[PDB]
Amino acid sequence: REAICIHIGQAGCQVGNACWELFCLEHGIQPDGAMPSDKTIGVEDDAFNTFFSETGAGKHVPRAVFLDLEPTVVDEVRTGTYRQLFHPEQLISGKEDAANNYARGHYTIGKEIVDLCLDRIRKLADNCTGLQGFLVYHAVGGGTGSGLGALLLERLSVDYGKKSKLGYTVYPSPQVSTAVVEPYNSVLSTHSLLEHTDVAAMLDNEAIYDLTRRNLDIERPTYTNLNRLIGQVVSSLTASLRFDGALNVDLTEFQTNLVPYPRIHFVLTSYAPVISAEKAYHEQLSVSEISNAVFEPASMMTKCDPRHGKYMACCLMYRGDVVPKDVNAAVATIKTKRTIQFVDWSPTGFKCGINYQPPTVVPGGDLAKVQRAVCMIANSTAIAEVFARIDHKFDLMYSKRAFVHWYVGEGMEEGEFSEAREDLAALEKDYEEVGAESADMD
Amino acid sequence: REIVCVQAGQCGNQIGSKFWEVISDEHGVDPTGTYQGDSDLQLERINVYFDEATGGRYVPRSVLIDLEPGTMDSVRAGPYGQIFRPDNFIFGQSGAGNNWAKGHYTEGAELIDSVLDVCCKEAESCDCLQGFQICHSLGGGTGSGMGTLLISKLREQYPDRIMMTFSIIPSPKVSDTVVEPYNTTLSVHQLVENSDESMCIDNEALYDICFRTLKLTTPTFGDLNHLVSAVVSGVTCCLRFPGQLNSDLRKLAVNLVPFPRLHFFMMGFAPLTSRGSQQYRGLSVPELTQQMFDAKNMMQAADPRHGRYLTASALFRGRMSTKEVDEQMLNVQNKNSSYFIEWIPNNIKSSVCDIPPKGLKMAVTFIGNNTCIQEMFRRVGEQFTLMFRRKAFLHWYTGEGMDEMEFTEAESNMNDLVSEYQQYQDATIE
C-alpha cells in the first residue's frame, strides 16, 4: 500500500519538487506538515498513507530521498518554503559533480556516497508494512544520474530482491542537445537499465516541448512546465492505489499484463487532455475523444512514431466520472481502426482501469481543470528507432575515439564501449525479431 | 434443508451483496437483523438461508473470502453489510495479480485452511445440509484459483452433497484483462472434473438484456448483479415455500444430466420489460414461456439455434392453473421439435410454487442444457492456442511453478468436452 520515491541528480530532484507539490495539494497536507480539518472534507481518509507517514503529534513527513553530488538544488530545497516538510536527513548532498562522466559517478565518487543512501532507504523501508515497489526518477544524459543511478539500482536489486523497481528515464533527445558526451552516457546507462528494471517509462524533452507549444499556448516554456506534466502522469498511475474506483489496478497486475517476455519491458507513455483553459470552452472532452487522443503520436511524451511498429499490450488508466460501457465502446472503436495494429499473437490487447478521483488543479498551473482523463502506457516495437538514432551518434563519435581518455582515466576499460554497443545492438535486434508475424516451417 | 453460500473475489462479493439484499427482502429481515415480516409463511423456512442468534436476530450462513481487503471494506460499507458475522470475513494482505498460479499455489495454501475451518464450522451446525452454492468469475485471479481450490477441498470433504456454481467468463469482445484465456482454460479444466452442475454467464449477454430488453439509459454493475441475483434466488424458491408440485436441486440434477460430463447449463428469467413498455402488455403464462425460450433472454453469447436441447427445466412461481403450464410446455416441445434431441421422448420438467418474487404476481426461471455451449469453449480454446503456440506470457506461470504439462492436460480435457457436445449437437441420418 506504500511506495518510496528515489530522486537522483538535477532532473530527478526538479521533477521531485513538482511531484511532491502535487501530492501535498491533492491530499491536503500544508507545507508545515499539518492537515487542517476543513481541507480534508471532499476526499476520503487514510489515502495519504501511500506517500506520507504521520508522527505521534500528527505531523506528516514524506517517503522520499533527494540525491545529488553538487550542493545546489538541495540547498534550494533547504532554503525554500518546504524546508520544514522534509526531514533533513532525507536531503543528501555531496561536494562535487560527476562532470558529465558516467565513469566518475560510477567508479570514483558515487561509491563514497552510496552507503549513506542505502542507510536512509533502509530507515524508510523499516517504517512500512506493505511496500510494493520503488519509483526512480533520473536522467541518463548526465554523469551522476547515469553512474549513481546504475550503481544504486544494482545495490538495491541485491539488498531488497523481489521488490519491484519502476523507472522514469529521460534519454537524450534526437536533435535538441545540451552536452556533447550524451551518447556515451546513454549507451553505458542502458545495460544497467536493461538488467535492473522491471518496467522502464520513456521521456524526451523535445516531445514535452512540442506538446507544450502545440496543445498548451506557451510561447516560451521552461522545465517547470515539463516537470508538472510528468508529475500529473505519475499521480495518474499511482491514483489506482489511493482512491476508490470501479476497476482498481495494483502495480503487479500492471507488470503482469504489460510485459510479455522478461527483457521486452521498455514502454511508451502518453496523456490525453493536455489543454489550455481558453481551448476548453470550444471542445467537449468525452471518454472516446481522449481515448482517441492517447494513440496519436502528437500526444506522446517520447519522440517515436508507433505507426512504424506493432503494439503488444496497452494499459489504459481512466480517472474521474467514467462508466465502464463508455470505456468498452472506446476500446472497441480503437480495436476497429486500421492504422492501429497488434501482433497476431496478442488478441486481447487491452487492460482497463477506472478510478473516481478527478485530476487536481495546481494554482500556477497551465492545464485546465477537467472532470476526466486517460493515461496510456503501451509496449511497441517502434521504440527500436530511438535506440538506432542514439547508436548512429555513438558510431560517429567512437570511430575516432573522440573523448575516450576521460572515461579511461576515471577507471574504465576501453572494452566496455564495444560491449555496451553490442548489448544495445542485441536489444534492437530482439525488438525486430519479436515483432515478426508467426513462424515458417522451414 | 440448509444451503451454504460461498462468494469469492470482487465480482463474487458484489453479486453476494445483491443476493443477500434480495433474500433479506423476501423474508422481511431488517438490516439490523430483526424480523419485521407480515406472514407466518416467511418464518417456517427462514432456517434455509439464515441461522438464528439469540434475542431474535438472524445472521446469514455465508463466508466472505478475498486476497485484498478493498472489497470487504466496500461490502461492510454497503446498506446490508452490518448483518454479516464479523468472524466470517477472511482476507489476506496482497492481491492475486490476475495470475491463476499465484491465486492457487502460493497465497492460496496460506489462507485455505482458515476458510475450510470456517466452512466446516458452518456445515456441521446445520441439522440437515443441502448443497453448496458458489459465485465467482473464471477470468480473474483469486476468484479462479481459490474458488477451484476450495471446490476441490469441499468436494473431498462432502462428496454426497450437491456442488453448484454460478460463473462469469470473459467476453472475447468486452474484456478487462489480457491473460484471461489461461485462467479460463485452467478453471474450466478444474470445474469439469469437480463440479456437479455449472451455470455460465457472459457480461455481454447481460448488457444486451439491459440495453435491448430493459432500455436502461446508464447501466451499472449493480443491474447486472441484480439479474444474476434474481435467477439464483429463483432456483431455490420451491425449496422454501409451499406449492402444487415441489422441486429440489437434486431433482433438477437427476432430470438434467444424461451423462456426468454434460453438466453445463444455460439460464434465463422471463418477466423482463422496461417501465415505459410495461403498460402495453400484460404478463401471462404463454408470454412468460415465449420469452423464456427466446434467445434474447438467455444469459450467454452462444445461441441455442446452433445446437439442440437434451433437457430443460422450468420453475413457475405464482397462483396459476396446472393445465396452462402443461399445455404450454407441450406446445413449445411440439412446435420446435427439431431443436430437441429425438432419443429422449419428452425433454421438459415443470414445477409450480405458490409464492412469487416480491413485486411480481408471477415469474418463471429457466435452466437449459444445450449443446451450443460448445461454441463458447471453442472460442476460449482458440484464443489459448494463439497465445500458447508463441509462449506469449508463460514465464509468469512457470516462475510461480506451473508445469507446461498442466496446460496441455487442461487443453486436452476441454477439447474432449467440446467433442462430446459436438457429437450430440448434429443429426445423423445414416
Binding site: 476520503e44 481518509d45 466520472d321 473516481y356 | 439509459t217 446508464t218
Partner: peptide, 26 residues
C-alpha cells in the same frame, strides 16, 4: 466516520451522473 463520507461521496456521484449530458461532457 469513514462510512458516512463514503456514502455521501457515492450519493453525490449518483446525483451527478443522472443527467446523460453531464455524464458525457460535463
Amino acid at each position: 466516520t469513514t462510512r458516512e463520507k463514503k456514502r455521501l461521496f457515492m450519493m453525490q456521484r449518483a446525483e451527478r451522473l443522472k443527467d446523460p449530458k453531464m455524464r458525457h461532457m460535463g
